[PDB]
Amino acid sequence: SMFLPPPECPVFEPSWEEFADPFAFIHKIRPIAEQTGICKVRPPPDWQPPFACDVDKLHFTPRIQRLNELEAQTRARDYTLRTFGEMADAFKSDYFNMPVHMVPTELVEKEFWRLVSTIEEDVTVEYGADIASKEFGSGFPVRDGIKLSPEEEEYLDSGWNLNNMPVMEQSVLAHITADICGMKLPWLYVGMCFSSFCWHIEDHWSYSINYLHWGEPKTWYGVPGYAAEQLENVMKKLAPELFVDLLHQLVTIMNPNTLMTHEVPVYRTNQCAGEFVITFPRAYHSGFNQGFNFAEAVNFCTVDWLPLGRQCVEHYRLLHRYCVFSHDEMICKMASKADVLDVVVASTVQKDMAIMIEDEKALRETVRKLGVIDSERMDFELLPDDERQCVKCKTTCFMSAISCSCKPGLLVCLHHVKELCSCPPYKYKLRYRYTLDDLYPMMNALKLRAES
């Protein structure tokens, strides 16, 4: 068996004027949508980006998936989009003994939840998942030195074209210098019946926007950001192995009815072709594909997200989880470009920078009281990430760190001064990006930009 479908998530149908700016629209819907974690966006009827691709020239190697509930999963032949589709269609039609399009969505959903819970069933599927590249590019029009049709030119500069969304001025991941390919570049998902995505949240508690270009629906389950710890507590009791590198993170499939039984609010939707799904910061989400389909997704960060981004990095520290990027480095990068930032962006960055400076000042005073006296300026941004992670908590260091000549190349963040080595702290060196005197003018530049 029995499945009680969770209540439906909000569906928005913006007008052209509302649709015109994705960021102003996401800000408008946020009070409603953040209460459900996920929402669906139906674009104006006439917004129809052209989808064109050669099914024989598009190649990928899919991931094999064993459909088992509470079974740990990490975050196989080569197929063309054509041969994958043939396999995907034969699979669904043989599973149900029905034409591929006559299978009710409610039936596929009930069946998915039955098959993941039954030990006797050994059903395996395949899923295509990867970043856009020369072998398999974006489903949206992109500028290329091929000639595009006026229908493609129309959607080239759209804020809803997922290639543009990250590099817009209302976004904050945009300004990031560091190569963070997994968080700025769109991901492409080629689905089949029952291929799925386990319960998870985005890196740095970012938003995600997901578009279904074509094919059969994608079924989603979402949990609001406020219920994140409640969901984790439920998952700790039932699947403890999941909790006990970044490319080694464990996720699992769990029936939304189990979460609902433990008072976790869960919402669902069937995302159809031509619709967007938006996930909000720290909103847990999972789902599965109803059949052969093609989706494109990207992470993004608004001004509203900046304080949550800081809370996230603090949470990663307590967990000893790796960061994708340094949040402080991003803030300081934007402060160094204050003259060209959007005024609302400059105002929000300035508020986060005031918190960063005050926390940094307290941390530096604390390490000085531990007897760390020597200091030297260090350009942290020049170091590869693997060269500037705290030995204890794995945080990406930017503002400051402690080193000892006895452990060359090793760093601790300022919370973990006692975790570096057994030398007395007078042997340590405080490595810092900026003095407090360099930071106050950077914050003033933001204030002047915001006050204009």
Ligand SMILES: [Mn+2]
């Ligand atoms: Mn099973």
Ligand SMILES: [Mn+2]
């Ligand atoms: Mn996701």
Ligand SMILES: [Zn+2]
């Ligand atoms: Zn640390």
Ligand SMILES: [Zn+2]
């Ligand atoms: Zn030492």
